[PDB]
Amino acid sequence: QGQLVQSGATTTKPGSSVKISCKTSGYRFNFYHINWIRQTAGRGPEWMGWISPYSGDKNLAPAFQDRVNMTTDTEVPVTSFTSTGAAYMEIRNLTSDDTGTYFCAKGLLRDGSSTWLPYLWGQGTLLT
Amino acid sequence: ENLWVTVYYGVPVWKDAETTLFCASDAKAKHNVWATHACVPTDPNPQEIHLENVTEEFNMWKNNMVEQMHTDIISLWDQSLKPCVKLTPLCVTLQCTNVTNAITDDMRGELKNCSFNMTTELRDKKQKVYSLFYRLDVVQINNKEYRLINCNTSAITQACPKVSFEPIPIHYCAPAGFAILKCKDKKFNGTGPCPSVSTVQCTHGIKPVVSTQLLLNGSLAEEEVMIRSENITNNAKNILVQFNTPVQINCTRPNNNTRKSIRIGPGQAFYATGDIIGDIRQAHCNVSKATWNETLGKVVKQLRKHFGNNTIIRFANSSGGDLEVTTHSFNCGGEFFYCNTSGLFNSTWISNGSNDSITLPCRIKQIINMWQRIGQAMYAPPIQGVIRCVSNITGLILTRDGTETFRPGGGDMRDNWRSELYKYKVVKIEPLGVAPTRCKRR
Amino acid sequence: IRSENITNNAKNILVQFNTPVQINCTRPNNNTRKSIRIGPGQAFYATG
Amino acid sequence: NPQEIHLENVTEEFNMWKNNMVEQMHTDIISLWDQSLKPCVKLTPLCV
Amino acid sequence: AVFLGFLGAAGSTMGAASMTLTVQARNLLSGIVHLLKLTVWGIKQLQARVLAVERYLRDQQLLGIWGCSGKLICCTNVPWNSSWSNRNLSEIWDNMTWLQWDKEISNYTQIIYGLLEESQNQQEKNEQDLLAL
Amino acid sequence: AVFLGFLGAAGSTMGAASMTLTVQARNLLSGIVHLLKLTVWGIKQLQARVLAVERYLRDQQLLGIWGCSGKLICCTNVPWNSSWSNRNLSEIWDNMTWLQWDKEISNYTQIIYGLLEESQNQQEKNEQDLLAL
Amino acid sequence: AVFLGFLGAAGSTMGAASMTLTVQARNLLSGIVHLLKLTVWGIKQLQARVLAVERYLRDQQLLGIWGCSGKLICCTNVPWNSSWSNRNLSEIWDNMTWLQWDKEISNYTQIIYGLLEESQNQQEKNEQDLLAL
Ligand SMILES: *[C@@H]1O[C@H](CO)[C@@H](O[C@@H]2O[C@H](CO)[C@@H](O[C@@H]3O[C@H](CO[C@H]4O[C@H](CO[C@H]5O[C@H](CO)[C@@H](O)[C@H](O)[C@@H]5O[C@H]5O[C@H](CO)[C@@H](O)[C@H](O)[C@@H]5O)[C@@H](O)[C@H](O[C@H]5O[C@H](CO)[C@@H](O)[C@H](O)[C@@H]5O)[C@@H]4O)[C@@H](O)[C@H](O[C@H]4O[C@H](CO)[C@@H](O)[C@H](O)[C@@H]4O[C@H]4O[C@H](CO)[C@@H](O)[C@H](O)[C@@H]4O[C@H]4O[C@H](CO)[C@@H](O)[C@H](O)[C@@H]4O)[C@@H]3O)[C@H](O)[C@H]2NC(C)=O)[C@H](O)[C@H]1NC(C)=O
Ligand SMILES: *[C@@H]1O[C@H](CO)[C@@H](O[C@@H]2O[C@H](CO)[C@@H](O[C@@H]3O[C@H](CO[C@H]4O[C@H](CO)[C@@H](O)[C@H](O[C@H]5O[C@H](CO)[C@@H](O)[C@H](O)[C@@H]5O)[C@@H]4O)[C@@H](O)[C@H](O[C@H]4O[C@H](CO)[C@@H](O)[C@H](O)[C@@H]4O)[C@@H]3O)[C@H](O)[C@H]2NC(C)=O)[C@H](O)[C@H]1NC(C)=O
Ligand SMILES: COc1cnc(-c2csc(C(=O)NCCO)n2)c2[nH]cc(C(=O)C(=O)N3CCC([C@@H](C#N)c4ccccc4)CC3)c12
Ligand SMILES: *[C@@H]1O[C@H](CO)[C@@H](O[C@@H]2O[C@H](CO)[C@@H](O[C@@H]3O[C@H](CO)[C@@H](O)[C@H](O)[C@@H]3O)[C@H](O)[C@H]2NC(C)=O)[C@H](O)[C@H]1NC(C)=O
Ligand SMILES: *[C@@H]1O[C@H](CO)[C@@H](O[C@@H]2O[C@H](CO)[C@@H](O[C@@H]3O[C@H](CO)[C@@H](O)[C@H](O)[C@@H]3O)[C@H](O)[C@H]2NC(C)=O)[C@H](O)[C@H]1NC(C)=O
Ligand SMILES: *[C@@H]1O[C@H](CO)[C@@H](O[C@@H]2O[C@H](CO)[C@@H](O)[C@H](O)[C@H]2NC(C)=O)[C@H](O)[C@H]1NC(C)=O
Ligand SMILES: *[C@@H]1O[C@H](CO)[C@@H](O[C@@H]2O[C@H](CO)[C@@H](O)[C@H](O)[C@H]2NC(C)=O)[C@H](O)[C@H]1NC(C)=O
Ligand SMILES: *[C@@H]1O[C@H](CO)[C@@H](O[C@@H]2O[C@H](CO)[C@@H](O)[C@H](O)[C@H]2NC(C)=O)[C@H](O)[C@H]1NC(C)=O
Ligand SMILES: *[C@@H]1O[C@H](CO)[C@@H](O[C@@H]2O[C@H](CO)[C@@H](O)[C@H](O)[C@H]2NC(C)=O)[C@H](O)[C@H]1NC(C)=O
Ligand SMILES: *[C@@H]1O[C@H](CO)[C@@H](O)[C@H](O)[C@H]1NC(C)=O
Ligand SMILES: *[C@@H]1O[C@H](CO)[C@@H](O)[C@H](O)[C@H]1NC(C)=O
Ligand SMILES: *[C@@H]1O[C@H](CO)[C@@H](O)[C@H](O)[C@H]1NC(C)=O
Ligand SMILES: *[C@@H]1O[C@H](CO)[C@@H](O)[C@H](O)[C@H]1NC(C)=O
Ligand SMILES: *[C@@H]1O[C@H](CO)[C@@H](O)[C@H](O)[C@H]1NC(C)=O
Ligand SMILES: *[C@@H]1O[C@H](CO)[C@@H](O)[C@H](O)[C@H]1NC(C)=O
Ligand SMILES: *[C@@H]1O[C@H](CO)[C@@H](O)[C@H](O)[C@H]1NC(C)=O
Ligand SMILES: *[C@@H]1O[C@H](CO)[C@@H](O)[C@H](O)[C@H]1NC(C)=O
Ligand SMILES: *[C@@H]1O[C@H](CO)[C@@H](O)[C@H](O)[C@H]1NC(C)=O
Ligand SMILES: *[C@@H]1O[C@H](CO)[C@@H](O)[C@H](O)[C@H]1NC(C)=O
Ligand SMILES: *[C@@H]1O[C@H](CO)[C@@H](O)[C@H](O)[C@H]1NC(C)=O
Ligand SMILES: *[C@@H]1O[C@H](CO)[C@@H](O)[C@H](O)[C@H]1NC(C)=O
Ligand SMILES: *[C@@H]1O[C@H](CO)[C@@H](O)[C@H](O)[C@H]1NC(C)=O
Ligand SMILES: *[C@@H]1O[C@H](CO)[C@@H](O)[C@H](O)[C@H]1NC(C)=O
Ligand SMILES: *[C@@H]1O[C@H](CO)[C@@H](O)[C@H](O)[C@H]1NC(C)=O
């Protein structure tokens, strides 16, 4: 299983800095990365970055190098293999050209070559 | 695609289980009632392996270790009181007088000077001997004639005076093929999924201290002050609070007593109380009024999380029961104290000293009964000299009544052991594992 | 019928039925048990 | 057949004053006497 | 290197735990479990001693009737009936832990133990017939 | 198929019983044999537990010193001295049962156990010398 | 031939003692060690019984985690670090006895037991990868 509910689809105007939430269930939040993906209309879908809910290690594209803050808070043990988590997303020098739908997707495997691969996605959020 | 079963021996997977736990102890060598000399020597390197990424379920209210320790300690006492003296000749008529009158009215009958006829080494010749007895060990006949408290309900066996009642740290260990899982969560409730989990070959040093209301010489929390019950909304389930700071208590029996041996038969000797050297004073306990109020406030704060930031909770004394449960009963240097605690639980706290200490008047018993069965009682031989012990109050055993009010109690011996074994859990190892992979024999 | 030496009269014959012949036993006297304290923790159960 | 194997070329160290067999036999015999005198008569009425 | 310790890789992936099996294998019979005094602690320890060897040999008994004596990773000739678990290899050894794997394979653990049993009886019968010439 | 059960082929031919050895092998240590209370039934059960493992390992010990560890049908290098039994193969495996066979081979069972013992000691010495290059 | 007996070659050279290992192997579990009466002699004998199987299996456990199950002379892949003993082969097997050899190799006996342990874990992992095709 696994669910990733995202925040609301409210809108702002250029110059601001919005926070996007992603709440997880049905799986151990620490065991898989959390990816942030952007599907703009005036560009192809872009991978923004992933972060480790276990090790805190983050990795984002150089196009978002000094403009994005990725944070996650510690999980909550529900069962032996189930926990609830949350991931956060921020933008710095923000304009209106960053308009589109934003998704959060967790990693694929816990090890191997496709560890962090965005596998299970959220329902997305509309922006400005 | 082409997948066959592949067998793996030694896979890190376990299942909950019940097993026999043996005892481990450290090197100290007389012989305590807990027989710690017969336990396997504990490793000077108490190995603890941390189980990263593991999240185990715990349930201190179904834990089997507490039910096993409850029977072990009782068996240790049964094992130690078997070969000792049967005091059935003591169940005889006693001619008692108060010992040294004139002090404070009805506090002179608290200890009596009783004389009685006793069997000697010769079966056909009696002796008139006397002994000092506390009031809680005698009852009248209705004249100044008395008898021991237990003569109509129980046979009495005095403890072999070479045994020590001082608790010694006991380590519980699981056999090979089993494991002990500790919950490292510093704010752990007692039940539920504990995130931080580590495995240990043996548990930490657990002193088998049997006390009432106040938990002594126990372990302390590292953060806040936890409160543990299986159904806190139920008023009939004892609340087990566990401090993080130790509120010190000083108990003493200032009466300098002398032990007089009395030959009641061939090889049989009854240890009577000779007399009192110096002042006949009152045994009691001190506890810093400042630290007890501060620590009692922390319990209030954590009790608020289960009853609301606005509600009002109050502390009252025991609401009745047996003497062992209505008082802070414990063992101090041999003698069994029974301390009034109306001064510790007499406070109402609102929604939102510093020099002296509060004292606790304790009475002393010698004929103490077995808690489980009826018909079995022990005679604690008289301790010579002045007694004084210094220990830590590290927890409580409270009771809700259904704005809020909390009173102490707890005559169940396994509530003591729950306060120390809540972190631990017994699981069995199952090292055989089968899984698919593209590997085929031959 | 089972014995080790049936021709020997000093070896008990153990017969085993195939049908059960029922037997009803009873003591109709309604007795009362009276406890008597013969010592500390010791009680003798007499017939009241 | 009390089998005894001779250990040729071997030279062992002994110390009868630290031997554990004597400390074990000392307790065994005492336990045998304790085991045998448990179920026998207590003559406490004779102390008259 | 790493060396997590006894059960140290209980939360690691099955493939990562499958590289530290000696870590658990050696602690299945030792520990701290010299006269036999039958006190409350002595009877307790004696049972702890017999219980360890008993459970240890029951695992070695199954390991023997499968032709895996003295092995930590032995391969068999019993194919993986996908009704046991249709999960793929990459999502098993790089994803699951041995604890949650045993949780879902638990129903068929007695079925598989029978297929490994008679496969070894027939294989040893085949080897005898091949050495009959 | 058939599946006669534990000792189910005790009266069958040696060859037919030689196809259901796992049926007896798995019941040599299990059964029904958790605290150790030393009551009349507790002492009785504890002995029943130690007795099973003791006898089980004595058979595995001989199976080890013969080079047959974890085997149900192992072949050896000890030829069959016809003075043991001059019976032919067809009148042994398609005729006798294991019970009556053990009854007539009973005298030489200690002789054969010695030939299998030193044959394994010399074979392992041969394998070491062959791997010394 | 010779047949010195149980421990009969304790004072012989290591090579000569290395030809009579079955002589000691068979007496590691038998002897004279049927009801369990808990008398002073009965408790004594029961401990003697559990102690034998316990020590016997601890040696077989190490022999298993080294890949030497059911072997008297198994060869390994752990090279001889000369810091253990710089003595030459001829002055070891035609000179020393096993008793005095164990006396000087005693410090490194725990070091060697670890190298044999993980060498077997990695070898079985190699054999699985080779049979994955
Ligand atoms: C748990 O908590 C419990 C509760 O807190 C606690 O219990 C406490 O236990 C201890 C020990 O068990 C108790 O300590 C005792 O205290 C006695 C009383 O001491 C106080 O009072 C005296 C006398 O007061 C009069 O005199 C002064 C002037 O000197 C006036 O100012 C007073 O107002 C009063 O005089 C008027 O009032 C009278 C009536 O009220 C009138 O009759 C009178 O005419 C006047 O009008 C004071 O002197 C004391 O001061 C000393 O202590 C203070 C601190 O309080 C210090 O600054 C300083 O050290 C002072 O010296 C104090 O205020 C003590 O008498 C008693 O010690 C004696 O008894 C023991 C045993 O009996 C002896 O072994 C010991 O040697 C002492 O004997 C000496 O004194 C007697 C009496 O005079 C002599 O007869 C004797 O010969 C001997 O004299 C020698 O020593 C003298 C000094 O030591 C010296 O002066 C002589 O010259 C000679 O050398 C003991 O210490 C304490 O009371 C308990 N607490 C309470 C609340 O009761 C427990 O311990 C806690 N812990 C636990 C359980 O673990
Ligand atoms: C407990 O559970 C957690 C969560 O499942 C486990 O953490 C995961 O472990 C696996 C395996 O160890 C990880 O998979 C690997 O992922 C790396 C990608 O990370 C690399 O890239 C980072 C960003 O570019 C980089 O910063 C890292 O470099 C160092 O820096 C960090 C800083 O924190 C440090 O922590 C690192 O350790 C590095 O030192 C990092 O290198 C990827 O490179 C791996 O692929 C290689 O290895 C595999 C085989 O393992 C091989 O197949 C590949 O081809 C390649 O060679 C591998 O995929 C995963 O990222 C971890 N985190 C998750 C899943 O969120 C943890 O191990 C568990 N522990 C226990 C004890 O159970
Ligand atoms: C004290 O209780 C007993 C009295 N006598 C006999 C007895 C005589 S003879 C005989 C015998 O031979 N048995 C063989 C067949 O039966 N056994 C007992 N045996 C087992 C006993 C217990 O474990 C037991 O009840 N406990 C434990 C000690 C407690 C305590 C402290 N410290 C405490 C006491 C009061 C206040 C605070 C703390 C509390 C309760 C026990
Ligand atoms: C408890 O009561 C007993 C009485 O049953 C007390 O024993 C008696 O105590 C008195 C007073 O000490 C003794 O008398 C004294 O005898 C000595 C020696 O001859 C003499 O010098 C004194 O002047 C005084 O007369 C008496 O002998 C003694 N009797 C017995 C049988 O012991 C006991 O003292 C009381 N104990 C306490 C603590 O009050
Ligand atoms: C709680 O723990 C403390 C410390 O572990 C216990 O204090 C110990 O109490 C005993 C007896 O009260 C002391 O033994 C005594 O030592 C003195 C001095 O040698 C001697 O005169 C006495 O005869 C007796 O042997 C012991 O020293 C003391 N230890 C320390 C460190 O203070 C306390 O009793 C425990 N309380 C409970 C209720 O378990
Ligand atoms: C309790 O009383 C005993 C005597 O009944 C005291 O023991 C004496 O101690 C002193 C030490 O100064 C010795 O010189 C005496 O020889 C002892 N007498 C006996 C009979 O033993 C003991 O000191 C008293 N304890 C206290 C705390 O006062
Ligand atoms: C209980 O007794 C102990 C020791 O008798 C007291 O601790 C002492 O406190 C004083 C304070 O000035 C220190 O100087 C000592 O070093 C302390 N002794 C020890 C052994 O720590 C303690 O204060 C007493 N508490 C109560 C409530 O009476
Ligand atoms: C009472 O509690 C204090 C504090 O928990 C104990 O003192 C600690 O003792 C440990 C012993 O391992 C030391 O490592 C700590 O440094 C001590 N801390 C402090 C603040 O003293 C004390 O031992 C307890 N006493 C009793 C009798 O239980
Ligand atoms: C045997 O006698 C006892 C009394 O000695 C009888 O017990 C009474 O039973 C009736 C039932 O109808 C109750 O109402 C009484 O309260 C009982 N009395 C006592 C003292 O227990 C018992 O019924 C008699 N049994 C028979 C078979 O007659
Ligand atoms: C992201 O936000 C948190 C919020 O407190 C802040 O502490 C952290 O420094 C931020 N990250 C960066 C790279 O500024
Ligand atoms: C003991 O003293 C109390 C209080 O003065 C008194 O009521 C009681 O009668 C006395 N008992 C004896 C036996 O002297
Ligand atoms: C002891 O027995 C005598 C009878 O000889 C009796 O008069 C006396 O009161 C008895 N003493 C006690 C203390 O019971
Ligand atoms: C104990 O804490 C756990 C932690 O989640 C909680 O689920 C449970 O309800 C708590 N129980 C009580 C009685 O407080
Ligand atoms: C706790 O007690 C209340 C009433 O006292 C009851 O309604 C509730 O069901 C109990 N909870 C559990 C888990 O038993
Ligand atoms: C509790 O306090 C009240 C108030 O004086 C008192 O009457 C009662 O006896 C006390 N109970 C106990 C057990 O101390
Ligand atoms: C306890 O003390 C209070 C006052 O301190 C008193 O009212 C109460 O009766 C005492 N309890 C007992 C059982 O003596
Ligand atoms: C019991 O029956 C067997 C059956 O053949 C017979 O041989 C034997 O003689 C009988 N014994 C007695 C005592 O009847
Ligand atoms: C049975 O008893 C008779 C005489 O009582 C005796 O002649 C015969 O030998 C006995 N049979 C056996 C088998 O002992
Ligand atoms: C899988 O198992 C079922 C019964 O457990 C059996 O009927 C079926 O034929 C098996 N299929 C394969 C492919 O092994
Ligand atoms: C990993 O295992 C869990 C166990 O339920 C499963 O839900 C998840 O889908 C698995 N991951 C992949 C990528 O299949
Ligand atoms: C195992 O059997 C239980 C029986 O109710 C069933 O609920 C469960 O789904 C089964 N699991 C698998 C993996 O077959
Ligand atoms: C058969 O065994 C005897 C002694 O048991 C021996 O003398 C004889 O040589 C053996 N013959 C063969 C052919 O093995
Ligand atoms: C076994 O030895 C006994 C000894 O008397 C003999 O009677 C029997 O015939 C022998 N059997 C075989 C098969 O050698
Ligand atoms: C021998 O062992 C030491 C440590 O025990 C190690 O440092 C050294 O590299 C080893 N040398 C060889 C040749 O194995």
mmCIF file with all atom_site columns, N, CA, C and O in Angstrom, chain G residues 41-52:
data_model
loop_
_atom_site.group_PDB
_atom_site.id
_atom_site.type_symbol
_atom_site.label_atom_id
_atom_site.label_alt_id
_atom_site.label_comp_id
_atom_site.label_asym_id
_atom_site.label_entity_id
_atom_site.label_seq_id
_atom_site.pdbx_PDB_ins_code
_atom_site.Cartn_x
_atom_site.Cartn_y
_atom_site.Cartn_z
_atom_site.occupancy
_atom_site.B_iso_or_equiv
_atom_site.pdbx_formal_charge
_atom_site.auth_seq_id
_atom_site.auth_comp_id
_atom_site.auth_asym_id
_atom_site.auth_atom_id
_atom_site.pdbx_PDB_model_num
ATOM 1  N N  . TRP G 1 41 ? 23.286 -39.123 43.732 1.00 0.00 ? 41 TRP G N  1
ATOM 2  C CA . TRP G 1 41 ? 23.938 -39.701 42.562 1.00 0.00 ? 41 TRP G CA 1
ATOM 3  C C  . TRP G 1 41 ? 23.143 -39.461 41.285 1.00 0.00 ? 41 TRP G C  1
ATOM 4  O O  . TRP G 1 41 ? 23.727 -39.408 40.198 1.00 0.00 ? 41 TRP G O  1
ATOM 5  N N  . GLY G 1 42 ? 21.819 -39.327 41.391 1.00 0.00 ? 42 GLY G N  1
ATOM 6  C CA . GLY G 1 42 ? 21.013 -39.108 40.202 1.00 0.00 ? 42 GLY G CA 1
ATOM 7  C C  . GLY G 1 42 ? 21.172 -37.711 39.637 1.00 0.00 ? 42 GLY G C  1
ATOM 8  O O  . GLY G 1 42 ? 21.310 -37.537 38.423 1.00 0.00 ? 42 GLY G O  1
ATOM 9  N N  . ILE G 1 43 ? 21.147 -36.696 40.504 1.00 0.00 ? 43 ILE G N  1
ATOM 10 C CA . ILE G 1 43 ? 21.410 -35.331 40.061 1.00 0.00 ? 43 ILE G CA 1
ATOM 11 C C  . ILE G 1 43 ? 22.819 -35.229 39.496 1.00 0.00 ? 43 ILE G C  1
ATOM 12 O O  . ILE G 1 43 ? 23.051 -34.566 38.478 1.00 0.00 ? 43 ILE G O  1
ATOM 13 N N  . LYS G 1 44 ? 23.777 -35.902 40.138 1.00 0.00 ? 44 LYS G N  1
ATOM 14 C CA . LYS G 1 44 ? 25.158 -35.882 39.668 1.00 0.00 ? 44 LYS G CA 1
ATOM 15 C C  . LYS G 1 44 ? 25.277 -36.465 38.266 1.00 0.00 ? 44 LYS G C  1
ATOM 16 O O  . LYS G 1 44 ? 25.999 -35.928 37.417 1.00 0.00 ? 44 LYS G O  1
ATOM 17 N N  . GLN G 1 45 ? 24.571 -37.567 38.000 1.00 0.00 ? 45 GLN G N  1
ATOM 18 C CA . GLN G 1 45 ? 24.677 -38.218 36.699 1.00 0.00 ? 45 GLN G CA 1
ATOM 19 C C  . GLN G 1 45 ? 23.952 -37.426 35.618 1.00 0.00 ? 45 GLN G C  1
ATOM 20 O O  . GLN G 1 45 ? 24.402 -37.384 34.467 1.00 0.00 ? 45 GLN G O  1
ATOM 21 N N  . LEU G 1 46 ? 22.827 -36.796 35.966 1.00 0.00 ? 46 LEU G N  1
ATOM 22 C CA . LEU G 1 46 ? 22.085 -36.015 34.982 1.00 0.00 ? 46 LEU G CA 1
ATOM 23 C C  . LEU G 1 46 ? 22.919 -34.851 34.466 1.00 0.00 ? 46 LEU G C  1
ATOM 24 O O  . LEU G 1 46 ? 22.975 -34.597 33.257 1.00 0.00 ? 46 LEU G O  1
ATOM 25 N N  . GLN G 1 47 ? 23.573 -34.127 35.375 1.00 0.00 ? 47 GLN G N  1
ATOM 26 C CA . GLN G 1 47 ? 24.487 -33.070 34.961 1.00 0.00 ? 47 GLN G CA 1
ATOM 27 C C  . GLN G 1 47 ? 25.601 -33.622 34.084 1.00 0.00 ? 47 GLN G C  1
ATOM 28 O O  . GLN G 1 47 ? 25.973 -33.006 33.078 1.00 0.00 ? 47 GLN G O  1
ATOM 29 N N  . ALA G 1 48 ? 26.140 -34.789 34.444 1.00 0.00 ? 48 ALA G N  1
ATOM 30 C CA . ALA G 1 48 ? 27.173 -35.408 33.623 1.00 0.00 ? 48 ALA G CA 1
ATOM 31 C C  . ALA G 1 48 ? 26.662 -35.715 32.222 1.00 0.00 ? 48 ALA G C  1
ATOM 32 O O  . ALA G 1 48 ? 27.440 -35.708 31.263 1.00 0.00 ? 48 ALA G O  1
ATOM 33 N N  . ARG G 1 49 ? 25.361 -35.977 32.082 1.00 0.00 ? 49 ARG G N  1
ATOM 34 C CA . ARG G 1 49 ? 24.791 -36.274 30.771 1.00 0.00 ? 49 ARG G CA 1
ATOM 35 C C  . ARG G 1 49 ? 24.607 -35.008 29.945 1.00 0.00 ? 49 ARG G C  1
ATOM 36 O O  . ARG G 1 49 ? 24.969 -34.971 28.763 1.00 0.00 ? 49 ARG G O  1
ATOM 37 N N  . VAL G 1 50 ? 24.040 -33.961 30.547 1.00 0.00 ? 50 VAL G N  1
ATOM 38 C CA . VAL G 1 50 ? 23.817 -32.719 29.817 1.00 0.00 ? 50 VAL G CA 1
ATOM 39 C C  . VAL G 1 50 ? 25.140 -32.039 29.493 1.00 0.00 ? 50 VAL G C  1
ATOM 40 O O  . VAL G 1 50 ? 25.277 -31.397 28.442 1.00 0.00 ? 50 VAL G O  1
ATOM 41 N N  . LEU G 1 51 ? 26.133 -32.170 30.372 1.00 0.00 ? 51 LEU G N  1
ATOM 42 C CA . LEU G 1 51 ? 27.421 -31.534 30.133 1.00 0.00 ? 51 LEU G CA 1
ATOM 43 C C  . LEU G 1 51 ? 28.129 -32.125 28.921 1.00 0.00 ? 51 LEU G C  1
ATOM 44 O O  . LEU G 1 51 ? 28.807 -31.397 28.186 1.00 0.00 ? 51 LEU G O  1
ATOM 45 N N  . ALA G 1 52 ? 27.978 -33.431 28.686 1.00 0.00 ? 52 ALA G N  1
ATOM 46 C CA . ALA G 1 52 ? 28.668 -34.063 27.567 1.00 0.00 ? 52 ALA G CA 1
ATOM 47 C C  . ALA G 1 52 ? 28.113 -33.584 26.233 1.00 0.00 ? 52 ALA G C  1
ATOM 48 O O  . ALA G 1 52 ? 28.873 -33.192 25.340 1.00 0.00 ? 52 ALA G O  1
#
